[PDB]
Ligand binder design. Structure first.
Ligand SMILES: CSc1nc2c(cc1NC(=O)N1CCC[C@H](C(N)=O)C1)CCCC2
Ligand SMILES: [Zn+2]
Length: 139
């Protein structure tokens, strides 16, 4: 679990969005596994606007942060799950690192701010949904 709080927006994995997220919907994209909802309180986070390919992510299944080198945002095949049919997920970045079900929502950060959130996993792999192109989160 996990979310980004920036301005009057809350960014979460679309597959983990609550009834309240959907009732205050701003934007969602099933192909990116992202959903943004509106908040009444001002958030705590800054979004990175950069091309970093190294950073640190929080891994809830280890209660620890790990450094990673990650690929550029791209269209990657993701196998069927309880939440989605088999499909290509866009704006996804992969890295070698630990992840397991329960870890989605963990934040990936570089020196400039928040880069994205955990969205997929593999055997010794972790995938992150990029948010750096969503310039409207800043306004
Ligand atoms: C960290 S999540 C995770 N981790 C692992 C496995 C599986 C998962 N789960 C997923 O990848 N998804 C399920 C939820 C929707 C995700 C999506 N973006 O389409 C896909 C298997 C075994 C190794 C670890
Ligand atoms: Zn950066």
């Amino acid at each position: 679990s996990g979310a980004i709080y920036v301005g009057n927006y809350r960014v979460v994995n679309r597959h983990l969005a609550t009834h309240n997220d959907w009732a205050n919907l701003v934007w969602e994209d099933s192909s990116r596994d992202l959903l943004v909802s509106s908040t009444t309180a001002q958030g705590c986070d800054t979004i990175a606007r950069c091309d970093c390919q190294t950073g640190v992510y929080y891994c809830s299944s280890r209660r620890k942060h790990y450094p990673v080198s990650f690929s550029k945002p791209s269209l990657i095949f993701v196998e069927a799950s309880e939440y989605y049919p088999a499909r290509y997920q866009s704006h996804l970045m992969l890295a070698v690192g630990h992840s397991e079900p329960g870890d989605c929502g963990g934040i990936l950060r570089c020196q400039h701010g928040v880069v994205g959130i955990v969205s997929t996993g593999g055997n010794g792999l972790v995938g992150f949904a990029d948010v750096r192109d969503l310039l409207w989160l800043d306004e």
